[PDB]
Amino acid sequence: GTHSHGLFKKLGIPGPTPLPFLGNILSYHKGFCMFDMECHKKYGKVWGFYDGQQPVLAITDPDMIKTVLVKECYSVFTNRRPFGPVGFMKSAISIAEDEEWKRLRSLLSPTFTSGKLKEMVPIIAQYGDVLVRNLRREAETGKPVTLKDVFGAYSMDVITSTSFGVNIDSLNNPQDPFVENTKKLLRFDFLDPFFLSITVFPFLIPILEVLNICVFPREVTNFLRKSVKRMKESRLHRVDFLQLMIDSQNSSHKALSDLELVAQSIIFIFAGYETTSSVLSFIMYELATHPDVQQKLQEEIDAVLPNKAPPTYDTVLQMEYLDMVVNETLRLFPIAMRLERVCKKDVEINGMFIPKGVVVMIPSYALHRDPKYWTEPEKFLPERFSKKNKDNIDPYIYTPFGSGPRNCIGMRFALMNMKLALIRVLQNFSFKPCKETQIPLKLSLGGLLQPEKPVVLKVESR
Amino acid sequence: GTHSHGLFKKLGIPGPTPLPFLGNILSYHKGFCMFDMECHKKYGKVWGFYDGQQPVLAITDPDMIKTVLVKECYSVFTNRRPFGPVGFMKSAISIAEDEEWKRLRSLLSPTFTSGKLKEMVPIIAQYGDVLVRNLRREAETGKPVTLKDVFGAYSMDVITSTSFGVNIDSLNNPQDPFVENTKKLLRFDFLDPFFLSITVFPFLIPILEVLNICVFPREVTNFLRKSVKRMKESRLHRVDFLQLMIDSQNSSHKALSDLELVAQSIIFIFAGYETTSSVLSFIMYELATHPDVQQKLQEEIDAVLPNKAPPTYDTVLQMEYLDMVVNETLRLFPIAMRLERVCKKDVEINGMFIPKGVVVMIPSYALHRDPKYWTEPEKFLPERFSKKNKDNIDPYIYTPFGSGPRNCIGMRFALMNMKLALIRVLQNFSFKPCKETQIPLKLSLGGLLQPEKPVVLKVESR
Ligand code: HEM
Ligand code: HEM
Ligand SMILES: CCCCCc1cc(O)c2c(c1)OC(C)(C)[C@@H]1CCC(C)=C[C@@H]21
Ligand SMILES: CCCCCc1cc(O)c2c(c1)OC(C)(C)[C@@H]1CCC(C)=C[C@@H]21
């Protein structure tokens, strides 16, 4: 069962020896992050391994990364790895391939412009107030707070109102039928018993397709397909993603059909719910364990927003230290962990031959903690992103949102969404560690970049 | 189980109603040929059906056929339908796809030039003598001859000597180890219990790949892989396909590797063994049931080749009535039956939208027996291809070797190979029907264009 396990030895590329059928997946017992760091340590700039029979070439050269992600993106490295039975979510932009992706990425790009985002801040700002009033209930009761719930409700509060206009206090209505379905849209643990079996038996993916089995629960999508169906029939002015997409199909490319439009609204929740929630928990953990950084940030917030002034789009871009705190956290915790591109031709880039079918991988977690580009990479030093030192940062080493034409389309939204939370939250509360707080934080050995234990902290009102 | 069975009704294309999972394959109980004729009768110029879940759009417009096979061949309709677990025969030119095919088709095109073919006639001519001496043994014994064996041995006699230089009287040595393996390379009956299950369960193809199961018997290819391995080690001048390919890798494209070179030699046998043998049986059946055509051909042969003169390359191209007999037979019996191309993009050709993934099919058998282009299409009238009437023949209606960049690469060889047999055979023997001869001939209801019963005829010596 080693039809292709001799490839990296033929090309003369170092890497760990694979087992038959399994490849190197037994080395995932400590997570993707630990595996990438160690391979980078042993083998250096380029190494290869096997996800079962699938060869994966890892690369850490900034020139090589720019070629893969930007230069030869359209011509060679256009798609990501197929990951399992997807059904009608083939129409989602992150899942679509080749010209279908290029068309979708164009039909949805004006939806994520800064000008469209500025019109969305009054909707995002409203649920910072909901976020604060939910926090104040737990602050004057003295109970340590579990961030992933109060923040998980916030990330859901923003999605429902900016992606459909549904206004729900999901923390005090954690039980409305619309919240039940959308909360079942968590990010995928590719080290769970399922996707590991997908890696060993990729020939089983076409099987699950003909059985209508999907990695997106059919009930959730069936609920949202008819829910959007009823929303579009009711609207027959506002700044919500669904509206901008409805306006898109109301015209070079074919207009977004009805099923394609629903599939995008679903992938926006999938890419934004647990991601936004997890980064906001990582940031508050660092603000708690470094009170000096939390105070300096609170001083800057009140300096731009006197007397707890409500944050605007412009006053958010005005806060440089807040952007430093966010950027430094995303360096330590790049929740995607990896970037992947499927090589679709036989190409030679930067003096290295890469054959068709090989998955090229950029280990983001490993590069963000590389001592050869970062001084004391484990420490939380927001000054790395000061306007003085941000020039010395290579944009292909620090890729928390990826790079190139296939980078995070919701990057501006995700950063504004997180910053509006921190501003309103730090305007009202200080965050101090608890005896039950895991210090130092340990990561999950699974397939998602998340804390081993949920981050619990103390919340005091200023 | 009808995820895509609504496609042709959405596009408004007529066709037979499909059953869940099965599609229209139950209509194959009378063969592909009967199914194409009837659909052409009911629905007209364009219709659609389903091979399970796979939509197949049939087209019969000459302008549309030229677009599919020539104009938009490289850009859209480059590949044929995937057909089952293929293994290392992915490297065969007929199986390869996209740029890999374009590269192989270039590395092998100078191998099939007329100039290379002229140097192969002395090898092909030698086994016409072997073919005659095998026929003479059965002619003066009065036994009716089964053509598919005496001709099957001839088509194998030509392949072994022109593809490897192996000189075997496969009719009197039907038992050498080299003949045993190569005779297991028959054309595929896509209506047998296997490939019908492949059509219903295409998700099972990736399964059979990981089990090393291949539609080419592993023992045969393993025998030939090491046999060619020993042939190339022994050669370390002649006009054999293996030599021309060995010369190709002895240099814009990468040279043919060792496994690719073996895979081509195998696909040449697969495409040439039963095909050449079956056409030669169809021709002799028509020469037997139309003695007037057989006499006129024998008169032309002796007029170009006096006193049973051995046929040269030039004297073969000199015989126009022989070319008429061959062409008229290939019209009645286009052994490929169909041409197929997978639509790889969303394209609109000649005012008709065709979506990505649909297999476009050209029903050759049906078009060759279309009364709207042929007068009395069932009758064997070689005068249709007379130099006077051959101008009125549309090259996209009569496609026995296909058309466009992906047509039969061995067309010139196959025609010369068959004609050299008929010349030498008609120089020595006349062929008269037997009481056991099936008159009129009935075709096999299976998935191969072949007689229902083997053609048995009487052979008398002139
Ligand atoms: C903390 C928040 C987020 C982080 C860290 C993040 C990170 C990423 C990364 C690393 C990628 C892959 C880039 C690449 O492959 O080069 C990506 C893709 C993507 N993200 Fe985000 N993301 C976040 C939030 C969001 C949000 C709020 C949206 C809202 C729509 C979103 C939508 C997408 C989409 C659609 C893609 C795929 C784009 C394509 O394939 O063309 N993400 N994200
Ligand atoms: C009576 C003899 C033969 C007939 C009727 C025949 C017919 C055909 C047809 C209809 C096609 C497909 C064309 C298309 O898809 O448009 C084809 C393809 C092909 N044939 Fe033949 N063939 C014959 C003999 C041979 C021989 C002797 C060879 C020797 C090498 C050969 C090699 C091939 C190859 C390699 C292809 C695929 C080419 C490609 O995919 O680029 N065939 N043949
Ligand atoms: C087995 C092959 C794995 C590839 C599957 C895969 C991996 C992956 O990291 C992502 C996928 C999909 O979908 C999108 C929506 C792009 C996500 C956006 C946000 C982040 C943090 C993760 C992205
Ligand atoms: C289920 C999809 C069916 C496609 C498989 C398929 C169909 C087909 O008609 C042929 C295939 C392969 O291979 C080659 C070598 C091109 C053959 C050449 C000679 C003739 C008569 C048949 C050709």
Side-chain angles (χ1 to χ4, degrees), chain A residues 131 134-135 145-158 170-171 272-274 276-285 417-418 421-422 425 431 455 457:
Chain A
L131 176 60
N134 287 332
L135 268 179
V145 180
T146 67
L147 302 186
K148 74 176 182 178
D149 300 332
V150 51
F151 281 148
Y154 165 78
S155 183
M156 185 63 73
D157 282 0
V158 183
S170 66
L171 195 54
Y273 173 60
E274 195 174 5
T276 301
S277 160
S278 278
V279 182
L280 284 179
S281 293
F282 282 131
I283 287 184
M284 301 313 297
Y285 167 80
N417 184 29
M418 294 180 296
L422 303 182
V425 147
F431 288 71
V455 178
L457 298 171

mmCIF file of all heavy atoms in Angstrom, chain A residues 131 134-135 145-158 170-171 272-274 276-285 417-418 421-422 425 431 455 457:
data_model
loop_
_atom_site.group_PDB
_atom_site.id
_atom_site.type_symbol
_atom_site.label_atom_id
_atom_site.label_comp_id
_atom_site.label_asym_id
_atom_site.label_seq_id
_atom_site.Cartn_x
_atom_site.Cartn_y
_atom_site.Cartn_z
ATOM 1 N N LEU A 131 -23.303 42.466 24.172
ATOM 2 C CA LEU A 131 -22.191 41.731 24.766
ATOM 3 C C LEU A 131 -21.828 42.292 26.136
ATOM 4 O O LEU A 131 -21.516 41.535 27.063
ATOM 5 C CB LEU A 131 -20.984 41.775 23.832
ATOM 6 C CG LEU A 131 -19.708 41.127 24.363
ATOM 7 C CD1 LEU A 131 -19.957 39.663 24.640
ATOM 8 C CD2 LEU A 131 -18.566 41.304 23.379
ATOM 9 N N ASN A 134 -24.536 41.514 28.821
ATOM 10 C CA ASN A 134 -24.411 40.125 29.246
ATOM 11 C C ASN A 134 -23.210 39.931 30.161
ATOM 12 O O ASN A 134 -23.247 39.087 31.064
ATOM 13 C CB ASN A 134 -24.302 39.209 28.029
ATOM 14 C CG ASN A 134 -25.621 39.054 27.296
ATOM 15 O OD1 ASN A 134 -26.692 39.162 27.893
ATOM 16 N ND2 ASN A 134 -25.548 38.792 25.996
ATOM 17 N N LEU A 135 -22.142 40.701 29.945
ATOM 18 C CA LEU A 135 -20.970 40.606 30.807
ATOM 19 C C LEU A 135 -21.219 41.266 32.155
ATOM 20 O O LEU A 135 -20.767 40.764 33.191
ATOM 21 C CB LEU A 135 -19.762 41.241 30.121
ATOM 22 C CG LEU A 135 -18.891 40.307 29.289
ATOM 23 C CD1 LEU A 135 -17.757 41.087 28.650
ATOM 24 C CD2 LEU A 135 -18.353 39.189 30.165
ATOM 25 N N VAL A 145 -15.959 33.915 34.440
ATOM 26 C CA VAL A 145 -16.685 33.813 33.180
ATOM 27 C C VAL A 145 -15.935 32.875 32.246
ATOM 28 O O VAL A 145 -14.700 32.903 32.181
ATOM 29 C CB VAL A 145 -16.869 35.202 32.539
ATOM 30 C CG1 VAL A 145 -17.631 35.094 31.229
ATOM 31 C CG2 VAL A 145 -17.588 36.131 33.500
ATOM 32 N N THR A 146 -16.683 32.030 31.533
ATOM 33 C CA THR A 146 -16.135 31.207 30.456
ATOM 34 C C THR A 146 -16.261 31.992 29.155
ATOM 35 O O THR A 146 -17.371 32.214 28.658
ATOM 36 C CB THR A 146 -16.859 29.867 30.362
ATOM 37 O OG1 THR A 146 -18.209 30.082 29.931
ATOM 38 C CG2 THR A 146 -16.872 29.170 31.714
ATOM 39 N N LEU A 147 -15.122 32.403 28.599
ATOM 40 C CA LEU A 147 -15.141 33.359 27.498
ATOM 41 C C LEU A 147 -15.834 32.796 26.266
ATOM 42 O O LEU A 147 -16.561 33.519 25.576
ATOM 43 C CB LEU A 147 -13.715 33.784 27.157
ATOM 44 C CG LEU A 147 -12.935 34.409 28.308
ATOM 45 C CD1 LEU A 147 -11.601 34.914 27.802
ATOM 46 C CD2 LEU A 147 -13.736 35.527 28.950
ATOM 47 N N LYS A 148 -15.626 31.509 25.974
ATOM 48 C CA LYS A 148 -16.100 30.956 24.710
ATOM 49 C C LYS A 148 -17.620 30.986 24.591
ATOM 50 O O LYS A 148 -18.141 30.915 23.474
ATOM 51 C CB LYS A 148 -15.586 29.527 24.526
ATOM 52 C CG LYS A 148 -16.260 28.483 25.397
ATOM 53 C CD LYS A 148 -15.749 27.092 25.054
ATOM 54 C CE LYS A 148 -16.440 26.021 25.878
ATOM 55 N NZ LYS A 148 -15.970 24.654 25.509
ATOM 56 N N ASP A 149 -18.340 31.102 25.704
ATOM 57 C CA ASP A 149 -19.792 31.203 25.641
ATOM 58 C C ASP A 149 -20.253 32.645 25.463
ATOM 59 O O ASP A 149 -21.085 32.932 24.597
ATOM 60 C CB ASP A 149 -20.413 30.594 26.899
ATOM 61 C CG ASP A 149 -20.052 29.133 27.076
ATOM 62 O OD1 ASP A 149 -19.799 28.456 26.056
ATOM 63 O OD2 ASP A 149 -20.019 28.662 28.232
ATOM 64 N N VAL A 150 -19.723 33.561 26.274
ATOM 65 C CA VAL A 150 -20.092 34.966 26.139
ATOM 66 C C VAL A 150 -19.580 35.525 24.817
ATOM 67 O O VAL A 150 -20.237 36.368 24.193
ATOM 68 C CB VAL A 150 -19.576 35.764 27.353
ATOM 69 C CG1 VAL A 150 -18.105 35.483 27.592
ATOM 70 C CG2 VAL A 150 -19.808 37.248 27.166
ATOM 71 N N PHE A 151 -18.422 35.052 24.351
ATOM 72 C CA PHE A 151 -17.913 35.480 23.053
ATOM 73 C C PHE A 151 -18.518 34.670 21.917
ATOM 74 O O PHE A 151 -18.752 35.206 20.827
ATOM 75 C CB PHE A 151 -16.392 35.374 23.022
ATOM 76 C CG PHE A 151 -15.698 36.502 23.712
ATOM 77 C CD1 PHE A 151 -14.489 36.300 24.351
ATOM 78 C CD2 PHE A 151 -16.254 37.768 23.724
ATOM 79 C CE1 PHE A 151 -13.850 37.338 24.987
ATOM 80 C CE2 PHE A 151 -15.616 38.812 24.360
ATOM 81 C CZ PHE A 151 -14.411 38.596 24.991
ATOM 82 N N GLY A 152 -18.757 33.377 22.141
ATOM 83 C CA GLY A 152 -19.448 32.586 21.138
ATOM 84 C C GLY A 152 -20.819 33.143 20.821
ATOM 85 O O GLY A 152 -21.247 33.155 19.664
ATOM 86 N N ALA A 153 -21.523 33.628 21.846
ATOM 87 C CA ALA A 153 -22.805 34.280 21.616
ATOM 88 C C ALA A 153 -22.633 35.592 20.863
ATOM 89 O O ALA A 153 -23.492 35.956 20.053
ATOM 90 C CB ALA A 153 -23.523 34.511 22.942
ATOM 91 N N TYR A 154 -21.531 36.307 21.100
ATOM 92 C CA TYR A 154 -21.310 37.565 20.392
ATOM 93 C C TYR A 154 -21.028 37.323 18.914
ATOM 94 O O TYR A 154 -21.622 37.971 18.045
ATOM 95 C CB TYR A 154 -20.162 38.350 21.027
ATOM 96 C CG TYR A 154 -19.659 39.472 20.142
ATOM 97 C CD1 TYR A 154 -20.362 40.663 20.032
ATOM 98 C CD2 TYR A 154 -18.489 39.330 19.403
ATOM 99 C CE1 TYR A 154 -19.910 41.685 19.219
ATOM 100 C CE2 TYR A 154 -18.032 40.347 18.586
ATOM 101 C CZ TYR A 154 -18.745 41.519 18.500
ATOM 102 O OH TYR A 154 -18.294 42.534 17.692
ATOM 103 N N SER A 155 -20.110 36.403 18.609
ATOM 104 C CA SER A 155 -19.814 36.105 17.214
ATOM 105 C C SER A 155 -21.058 35.628 16.477
ATOM 106 O O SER A 155 -21.223 35.912 15.286
ATOM 107 C CB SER A 155 -18.699 35.062 17.123
ATOM 108 O OG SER A 155 -18.339 34.813 15.773
ATOM 109 N N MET A 156 -21.949 34.916 17.171
ATOM 110 C CA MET A 156 -23.216 34.525 16.565
ATOM 111 C C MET A 156 -24.164 35.712 16.462
ATOM 112 O O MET A 156 -24.908 35.835 15.482
ATOM 113 C CB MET A 156 -23.855 33.393 17.369
ATOM 114 C CG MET A 156 -25.129 32.840 16.755
ATOM 115 S SD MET A 156 -24.833 32.079 15.146
ATOM 116 C CE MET A 156 -24.003 30.572 15.634
ATOM 117 N N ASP A 157 -24.152 36.599 17.462
ATOM 118 C CA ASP A 157 -24.989 37.794 17.410
ATOM 119 C C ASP A 157 -24.659 38.649 16.193
ATOM 120 O O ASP A 157 -25.556 39.230 15.572
ATOM 121 C CB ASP A 157 -24.823 38.614 18.692
ATOM 122 C CG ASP A 157 -25.605 38.044 19.863
ATOM 123 O OD1 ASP A 157 -26.284 37.013 19.682
ATOM 124 O OD2 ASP A 157 -25.541 38.629 20.968
ATOM 125 N N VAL A 158 -23.377 38.734 15.836
ATOM 126 C CA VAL A 158 -22.977 39.562 14.703
ATOM 127 C C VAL A 158 -23.316 38.878 13.386
ATOM 128 O O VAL A 158 -23.703 39.536 12.416
ATOM 129 C CB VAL A 158 -21.478 39.899 14.793
ATOM 130 C CG1 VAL A 158 -21.074 40.823 13.656
ATOM 131 C CG2 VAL A 158 -21.164 40.534 16.129
ATOM 132 N N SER A 170 -28.685 35.915 21.431
ATOM 133 C CA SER A 170 -28.435 34.479 21.477
ATOM 134 C C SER A 170 -27.914 34.005 22.826
ATOM 135 O O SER A 170 -27.851 32.793 23.052
ATOM 136 C CB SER A 170 -27.441 34.085 20.383
ATOM 137 O OG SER A 170 -26.168 34.659 20.623
ATOM 138 N N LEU A 171 -27.531 34.912 23.721
ATOM 139 C CA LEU A 171 -27.107 34.462 25.039
ATOM 140 C C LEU A 171 -28.290 34.317 25.983
ATOM 141 O O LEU A 171 -28.316 33.400 26.810
ATOM 142 C CB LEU A 171 -26.074 35.417 25.631
ATOM 143 C CG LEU A 171 -25.332 34.811 26.822
ATOM 144 C CD1 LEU A 171 -24.712 33.478 26.429
ATOM 145 C CD2 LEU A 171 -24.272 35.761 27.338
ATOM 146 N N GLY A 272 -16.671 32.088 10.112
ATOM 147 C CA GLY A 272 -16.641 33.256 10.971
ATOM 148 C C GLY A 272 -17.081 33.027 12.398
ATOM 149 O O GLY A 272 -16.775 33.842 13.274
ATOM 150 N N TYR A 273 -17.797 31.934 12.655
ATOM 151 C CA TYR A 273 -18.370 31.740 13.985
ATOM 152 C C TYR A 273 -17.305 31.342 15.003
ATOM 153 O O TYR A 273 -16.955 32.127 15.889
ATOM 154 C CB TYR A 273 -19.488 30.698 13.930
ATOM 155 C CG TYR A 273 -20.018 30.330 15.290
ATOM 156 C CD1 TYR A 273 -20.575 31.293 16.119
ATOM 157 C CD2 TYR A 273 -19.953 29.023 15.749
ATOM 158 C CE1 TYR A 273 -21.058 30.964 17.370
ATOM 159 C CE2 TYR A 273 -20.434 28.681 16.998
ATOM 160 C CZ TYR A 273 -20.986 29.656 17.804
ATOM 161 O OH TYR A 273 -21.467 29.323 19.048
ATOM 162 N N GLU A 274 -16.778 30.120 14.893
ATOM 163 C CA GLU A 274 -15.788 29.665 15.860
ATOM 164 C C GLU A 274 -14.446 30.367 15.688
ATOM 165 O O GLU A 274 -13.687 30.468 16.655
ATOM 166 C CB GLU A 274 -15.607 28.149 15.762
ATOM 167 C CG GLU A 274 -14.870 27.545 16.951
ATOM 168 C CD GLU A 274 -14.822 26.024 16.923
ATOM 169 O OE1 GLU A 274 -15.284 25.426 15.928
ATOM 170 O OE2 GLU A 274 -14.324 25.424 17.901
ATOM 171 N N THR A 276 -13.863 33.737 14.865
ATOM 172 C CA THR A 276 -13.939 34.990 15.614
ATOM 173 C C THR A 276 -13.991 34.733 17.111
ATOM 174 O O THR A 276 -13.320 35.418 17.893
ATOM 175 C CB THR A 276 -15.168 35.791 15.180
ATOM 176 O OG1 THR A 276 -15.095 36.066 13.776
ATOM 177 C CG2 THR A 276 -15.254 37.101 15.948
ATOM 178 N N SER A 277 -14.784 33.745 17.528
ATOM 179 C CA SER A 277 -14.930 33.439 18.947
ATOM 180 C C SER A 277 -13.615 32.974 19.557
ATOM 181 O O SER A 277 -13.310 33.306 20.709
ATOM 182 C CB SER A 277 -16.013 32.377 19.136
ATOM 183 O OG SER A 277 -15.880 31.723 20.384
ATOM 184 N N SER A 278 -12.821 32.208 18.807
ATOM 185 C CA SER A 278 -11.586 31.673 19.374
ATOM 186 C C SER A 278 -10.505 32.738 19.483
ATOM 187 O O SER A 278 -9.743 32.754 20.457
ATOM 188 C CB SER A 278 -11.089 30.490 18.547
ATOM 189 O OG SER A 278 -11.782 29.308 18.912
ATOM 190 N N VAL A 279 -10.410 33.631 18.498
ATOM 191 C CA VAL A 279 -9.408 34.687 18.580
ATOM 192 C C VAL A 279 -9.726 35.637 19.728
ATOM 193 O O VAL A 279 -8.822 36.099 20.437
ATOM 194 C CB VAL A 279 -9.301 35.431 17.239
ATOM 195 C CG1 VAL A 279 -8.221 36.500 17.320
ATOM 196 C CG2 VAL A 279 -9.001 34.454 16.123
ATOM 197 N N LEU A 280 -11.011 35.943 19.940
ATOM 198 C CA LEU A 280 -11.378 36.836 21.034
ATOM 199 C C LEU A 280 -11.077 36.213 22.391
ATOM 200 O O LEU A 280 -10.823 36.941 23.358
ATOM 201 C CB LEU A 280 -12.855 37.220 20.935
ATOM 202 C CG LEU A 280 -13.226 38.259 19.872
ATOM 203 C CD1 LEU A 280 -14.721 38.533 19.870
ATOM 204 C CD2 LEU A 280 -12.452 39.549 20.084
ATOM 205 N N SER A 281 -11.091 34.882 22.485
ATOM 206 C CA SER A 281 -10.705 34.227 23.731
ATOM 207 C C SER A 281 -9.193 34.228 23.909
ATOM 208 O O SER A 281 -8.695 34.392 25.029
ATOM 209 C CB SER A 281 -11.246 32.798 23.768
ATOM 210 O OG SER A 281 -12.661 32.792 23.841
ATOM 211 N N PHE A 282 -8.448 34.051 22.817
ATOM 212 C CA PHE A 282 -6.993 34.107 22.896
ATOM 213 C C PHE A 282 -6.507 35.503 23.267
ATOM 214 O O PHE A 282 -5.504 35.650 23.970
ATOM 215 C CB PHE A 282 -6.385 33.665 21.565
ATOM 216 C CG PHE A 282 -6.367 32.177 21.361
ATOM 217 C CD1 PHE A 282 -6.826 31.621 20.178
ATOM 218 C CD2 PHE A 282 -5.887 31.333 22.351
ATOM 219 C CE1 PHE A 282 -6.811 30.249 19.979
ATOM 220 C CE2 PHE A 282 -5.867 29.960 22.162
ATOM 221 C CZ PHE A 282 -6.333 29.417 20.971
ATOM 222 N N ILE A 283 -7.204 36.540 22.802
ATOM 223 C CA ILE A 283 -6.781 37.903 23.096
ATOM 224 C C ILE A 283 -7.024 38.235 24.563
ATOM 225 O O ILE A 283 -6.173 38.846 25.223
ATOM 226 C CB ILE A 283 -7.495 38.897 22.164
ATOM 227 C CG1 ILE A 283 -6.928 38.800 20.751
ATOM 228 C CG2 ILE A 283 -7.349 40.317 22.679
ATOM 229 C CD1 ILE A 283 -7.516 39.811 19.799
ATOM 230 N N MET A 284 -8.178 37.839 25.101
ATOM 231 C CA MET A 284 -8.469 38.155 26.494
ATOM 232 C C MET A 284 -7.585 37.367 27.451
ATOM 233 O O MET A 284 -7.273 37.854 28.543
ATOM 234 C CB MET A 284 -9.942 37.902 26.797
ATOM 235 C CG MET A 284 -10.883 38.710 25.933
ATOM 236 S SD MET A 284 -10.415 40.444 25.823
ATOM 237 C CE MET A 284 -10.576 40.953 27.531
ATOM 238 N N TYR A 285 -7.175 36.155 27.067
ATOM 239 C CA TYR A 285 -6.215 35.420 27.884
ATOM 240 C C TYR A 285 -4.894 36.170 27.976
ATOM 241 O O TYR A 285 -4.283 36.242 29.049
ATOM 242 C CB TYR A 285 -5.992 34.015 27.319
ATOM 243 C CG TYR A 285 -4.797 33.310 27.928
ATOM 244 C CD1 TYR A 285 -4.886 32.702 29.176
ATOM 245 C CD2 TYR A 285 -3.577 33.259 27.262
ATOM 246 C CE1 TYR A 285 -3.793 32.063 29.742
ATOM 247 C CE2 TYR A 285 -2.480 32.621 27.820
ATOM 248 C CZ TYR A 285 -2.593 32.028 29.060
ATOM 249 O OH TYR A 285 -1.506 31.392 29.616
ATOM 250 N N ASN A 417 -14.688 43.346 13.314
ATOM 251 C CA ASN A 417 -15.644 42.699 14.206
ATOM 252 C C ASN A 417 -15.023 42.411 15.564
ATOM 253 O O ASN A 417 -15.654 42.634 16.604
ATOM 254 C CB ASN A 417 -16.163 41.407 13.570
ATOM 255 C CG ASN A 417 -17.237 40.742 14.397
ATOM 256 O OD1 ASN A 417 -17.981 41.407 15.121
ATOM 257 N ND2 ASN A 417 -17.324 39.418 14.302
ATOM 258 N N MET A 418 -13.783 41.924 15.580
ATOM 259 C CA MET A 418 -13.133 41.629 16.851
ATOM 260 C C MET A 418 -12.764 42.904 17.600
ATOM 261 O O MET A 418 -12.879 42.962 18.829
ATOM 262 C CB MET A 418 -11.891 40.770 16.620
ATOM 263 C CG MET A 418 -12.191 39.385 16.092
ATOM 264 S SD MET A 418 -10.690 38.425 15.843
ATOM 265 C CE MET A 418 -9.860 39.375 14.568
ATOM 266 N N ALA A 421 -15.574 44.577 19.549
ATOM 267 C CA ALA A 421 -15.829 43.886 20.807
ATOM 268 C C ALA A 421 -14.841 44.321 21.882
ATOM 269 O O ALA A 421 -15.241 44.720 22.982
ATOM 270 C CB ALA A 421 -15.765 42.373 20.597
ATOM 271 N N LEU A 422 -13.540 44.260 21.574
ATOM 272 C CA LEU A 422 -12.521 44.593 22.565
ATOM 273 C C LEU A 422 -12.667 46.025 23.059
ATOM 274 O O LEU A 422 -12.483 46.299 24.250
ATOM 275 C CB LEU A 422 -11.128 44.379 21.978
ATOM 276 C CG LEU A 422 -10.817 42.979 21.456
ATOM 277 C CD1 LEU A 422 -9.386 42.910 20.945
ATOM 278 C CD2 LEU A 422 -11.060 41.946 22.542
ATOM 279 N N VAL A 425 -15.703 46.220 25.314
ATOM 280 C CA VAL A 425 -15.506 45.380 26.490
ATOM 281 C C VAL A 425 -14.456 45.982 27.419
ATOM 282 O O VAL A 425 -14.651 46.041 28.639
ATOM 283 C CB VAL A 425 -15.145 43.949 26.054
ATOM 284 C CG1 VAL A 425 -14.203 43.306 27.045
ATOM 285 C CG2 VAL A 425 -16.410 43.119 25.910
ATOM 286 N N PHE A 431 -9.975 42.465 33.091
ATOM 287 C CA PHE A 431 -9.976 41.007 33.087
ATOM 288 C C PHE A 431 -8.745 40.504 33.824
ATOM 289 O O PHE A 431 -7.613 40.746 33.392
ATOM 290 C CB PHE A 431 -10.020 40.470 31.654
ATOM 291 C CG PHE A 431 -11.350 40.660 30.982
ATOM 292 C CD1 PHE A 431 -11.780 41.923 30.608
ATOM 293 C CD2 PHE A 431 -12.178 39.577 30.735
ATOM 294 C CE1 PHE A 431 -13.005 42.101 29.999
ATOM 295 C CE2 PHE A 431 -13.405 39.750 30.121
ATOM 296 C CZ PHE A 431 -13.818 41.012 29.753
ATOM 297 N N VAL A 455 -11.014 28.973 28.448
ATOM 298 C CA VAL A 455 -10.424 30.100 29.160
ATOM 299 C C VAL A 455 -11.459 30.686 30.113
ATOM 300 O O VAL A 455 -12.491 31.213 29.683
ATOM 301 C CB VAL A 455 -9.910 31.155 28.173
ATOM 302 C CG1 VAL A 455 -9.352 32.354 28.916
ATOM 303 C CG2 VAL A 455 -8.851 30.551 27.265
ATOM 304 N N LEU A 457 -11.889 33.446 33.285
ATOM 305 C CA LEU A 457 -11.242 34.633 33.820
ATOM 306 C C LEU A 457 -12.218 35.368 34.728
ATOM 307 O O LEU A 457 -13.422 35.101 34.730
ATOM 308 C CB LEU A 457 -10.758 35.561 32.699
ATOM 309 C CG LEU A 457 -9.700 35.022 31.734
ATOM 310 C CD1 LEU A 457 -9.502 35.981 30.574
ATOM 311 C CD2 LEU A 457 -8.387 34.782 32.463
#
